[PDB]
Design a binder for this molecule. Structure first.
Ligand SMILES: N[C@@H](CC(=O)O)C(=O)O
Ligand SMILES: N[C@@H](CC(=O)O)C(=O)O
Ligand SMILES: N[C@@H](CC(=O)O)C(=O)O
Ligand SMILES: N[C@@H](CC(=O)O)C(=O)O
Lengths: 326, 316, 316, 326
């Protein structure tokens, strides 16, 4: 059986409530050893080793944990056959894309969480963890980038997003679809992401203590420019706009970001709209303003790539090329 | 043989690209005369990414004032913020006659432009007696959508508008609608919100949550004396710790705080990970951040008390 | 403090895998006693791929007879044909108290089995006074779905059941339902269908359309004297020429013919490519083939006239 | 500009009504030359040549037209840079998969239709045809199998299906997602089908006058076995079951197909359920009965592959292997 390493970071998968039928609970309580022992069927498919990296709710996920995870996977690659990262669902789509761009280990790296606490009736954690280990143990899972496995489905770290606040089926790759489905412990892979990932990217965080500062501002009717101005006044390296429609901006926000771009702030136009690309050649002349269009990357995913782009370059044309390749 | 009188109120948008006038918009679809007596009025001519409180107030007052002068309204509008205007009017229009919003995802000069048939179907909907008393509506891609749940789901697709939590009210085929649903949430004349004499709306901003989120946007809204802040939370309305800290302080120093979610479907519920009663927060339910802002502004015209705002978010 | 009386009628399905008894099903979820006084009765114990007219008649008669002896019903059922049983009961149950169907997509012995919480939520729904007068319901994956529109959309997903044309009625969180919709189509006590004295239902079969489709299935149903045939058409109810020829003959020689569609969402409409009045055909609207069969069988207990059947397909 | 050949077969894209605002129309009236002249923007992107193969509604599509199309594309491959097939929407998903398995030409083959007649207000035909030609002209479209292009989206011929009876956005690849989106005449491809297609299949129809007979029977409550018996009595080479749930069958239908399989009839279990695979190792012991599980192929798609499988073999184990590879 393959050796599989579980790196635990917290989340509702490790959470507990006082009743199996009531919704209130606290995240990231139980340890990695309890999650493993809760699924004795794991011993049929893998030799599982658990390590507790942190124990937080992923609403509190941060740069420091991301750097810890990437360095640990890259350091321990030769010591195991694959990785499973247990994680909160709230920002799993962000961590998955970060690791998708920075992990250099060729072996499967699979993220997994649970929408229901471990104590709940029909808790989804146990089978999710089982299927995550199935995926990390599958030879065919290698070289597909960092993966998220939820609700019997293998999803690429770039397109995967949380589509619903409570549904166990919440995780979907809403633009390009899943890579494969899991049935009876086997996967029929019919897709693989074409965008460059893992060892095909230039992003190398092995020696980094911190990441460039990138914030996100929302657009809506009558939007205040004060959030954007606050990020500019703090000297943020980049700002992602969650625009309306095809990456459009309320005039006040547009005006502030255009002025900041001329001072050197990197500005990426994304969209609050949950599917579809923020394109070039629509209503915003990105070349004129020095802006970058995010494509299908939603605002929090665009932040991930912008932070890493800014470890390499501050030039908008080069950043746009990065947003066209990764 | 007499046809209903339908008033088109034009605000801009790609359906008017907003540069072409409301008379040009009407004459482009001569078949409108087969179904309605159409009169057009230009309210503004803007891209809806620049929609604002003043235009919202103008539209609600115009519809309420002119209700008895027409049989139904169509509002032509940009698609980017149509879902916000639709819900604002859903809460403030007191005319029970049909009010239908419509836009276009493709330019009027483009191949297979969707604007012409979109407008035709919007007039069909405003002219159907069955459309009355269903709240303010959005009509796009042969579908009638309630103004509360409707949202733009895709950046470019002509089929982008969907009521993603509770579904559409009816589909349009051959100029006829089979309505199978109506919104249960209280709208129009069943709400207490009355903007007839207001020149401005309470100030409500939106902050985004994500890994490592800065508290600076939330702090800037607080420093500016904002009346309310809507959080686009992660998952089920959850907050990054720094943002949580700032909003907890704001809620105990006057500011109304509504937890919504950046997640595109599903409710932000009570009784999950955040003790709303302890912090004086309000949970937005299925209202996404920009919709929650609409209701929070109007709630703040009535009350600043968090329990009373929560009740408003449970009824409208 | 008193809790509602809820009767569980068991028919089989993976939620009972149908091999385990109804008492075993109940005792597996002890928290049921926190929300209801539960009594279980075994009606049949079959896989729902073998569901049939006799079980449908038994269930409708049992619910109608026992209505005044309980406060609500839960029917445990296989997922494969739950959407058909749900609509049959939707049309024939005259009890206005909640009737909720539920199943499970994973075996009860499997990791993260969905059956236990599914049953809990089904009892929550049957015990909610707000669930009355909404027709027969299906409760799956924290969602309340009307029996007319609900359908199985995926072969394995625990989230498979969706009301794909008009959306759900409400979502369940923390044991509470926020209902925002109700079906406008006439159901239960608002239909004329009365099976109380029937031992059998009119014979209605379904034929599939595709490229090069054989007319032999349609011919075999005609040769057997079927009372009606539902066509799973291509696109908007269209028929392969050979199948069209056979059904046109059948419609003029007694047989009721309903055009539905193999396409999983959207209505089969009148006034498209098929002149239904010329051929004596009925268009099924949003009813998929197996749902259209349910309504056609019941229509044929009232009338054989195509215009009157079309009216039934426009009202129920 | 590339040379693009339009092969016309009919459909609503070629249909016309007496009014732009009323829904009634007739299919396959106007000729290929009228469709081309209706889109003068095509001359900006390609040298277009039209040929009328047939002019039918695709509800009347049949084996003979399929064989004509495959032979024509394979014969004329060297004479053009890519193919667009205008087609009715009702069975486009069937023809696309047939050509996906039998076309040996390496150059892009793109199918396209229209949900609204050419005479209708906001008719979708003109822009659909434009985007189909864009796709056939794109070098990156080659080697992705036969494609369907509808509503700004490039879809693989295997997974693409018509999901709605009237919506212009009806065509979706409901299990694995689209291959790319089209904006401003350009495609960002992020996926390609892993299942073997075109020149990687053994199916060679170049000398065939006819195809094996395969019919489809529906399952539902109280289902009659008479449709299945009628196909068996006619000596059908194969029968596809549109089963309930995960490919399950009503007992009467099961009994008839099991008896037929022992006489040599090929029996494929598919599902009337619109998404998801009909799997092995669920409730039906396929090996015991000699049945084949269709995977994600819906009943009409499973018929296509079964017909072609039956040109090579009647052995259920070999047919199952075909259903696992193509
Ligand atoms: N609050 C949790 C949500 C979850 O795990 O589902 C987290 O992200 O850690
Ligand atoms: N920018 C435009 C988008 C559209 O009309 O579709 C607007 O909202 O006004
Ligand atoms: N074959 C089963 C499927 C299920 O229960 O999910 C049935 O319908 O009875
Ligand atoms: N009946 C038409 C439908 C369409 O083209 O949309 C056909 O398949 O030819």
């Amino acid at each position: 059986l393959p050796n599989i390493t579980i790196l635990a970071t917290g989340g509702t998968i490790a959470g507990g409530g006082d009743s199996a039928t009531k919704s209130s609970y606290t995240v990231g309580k139980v340890g990695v050893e309890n999650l493993v022992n809760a699924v004795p069927q794991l011993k049929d498919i893998a030799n599982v080793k658990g390590e507790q990296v942190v124990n937080i709710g992923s609403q509190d996920m941060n740069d420091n944990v991301w750097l810890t995870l990437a360095k640990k996977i890259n350091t321990d690659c030769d010591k195991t056959d694959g990785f499973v990262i247990t994680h909160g669902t709230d920002t799993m789509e962000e961590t998955a894309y970060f690791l998708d761009l920075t992990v250099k280990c060729d072996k499967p790296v699979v993220m997994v969480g649970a929408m229901r606490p471990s104590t709940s009736m029909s808790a989804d954690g146990p089978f999710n963890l089982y299927n995550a280990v199935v995926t990390a143990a599958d030879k065919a899972s290698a070289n597909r980038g960092v993966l998220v496995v939820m609700n019997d489905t293998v999803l690429d770290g770039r397109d995967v997003t949380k589509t619903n606040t409570t549904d166990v089926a919440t995780f979907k790759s809403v633009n390009y679809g899943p890579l494969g489905y899991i049935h009876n412990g086997k996967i029929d892979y019919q897709r693989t992401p074409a965008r460059k990932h893992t060892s095909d990217t230039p992003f190398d965080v092995s020696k980094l203590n911190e990441l460039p500062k990138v914030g996100i501002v929302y657009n809506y009717a009558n939007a205040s420019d004060l959030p954007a101005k606050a990020l500019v006044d703090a000297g943020y390296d980049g700002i992602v706009s969650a625009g309306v429609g095809n990456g459009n901006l309320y005039k006040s926000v547009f005006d502030t970001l255009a002025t900041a771009a001329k001072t050197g702030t990197a500005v990426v136009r994304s969209s609050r709209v949950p599917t579809g690309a923020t394109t070039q050649d629509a209503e915003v002349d990105d070349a004129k303003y020095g802006f970058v269009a995010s494509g299908t990357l939603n605002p929090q995913k665009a932040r991930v790539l912008l932070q890493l782009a800014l470890t390499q370059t501050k030039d908008p044309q080069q950043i746009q090329q990065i947003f066209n390749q990764y």
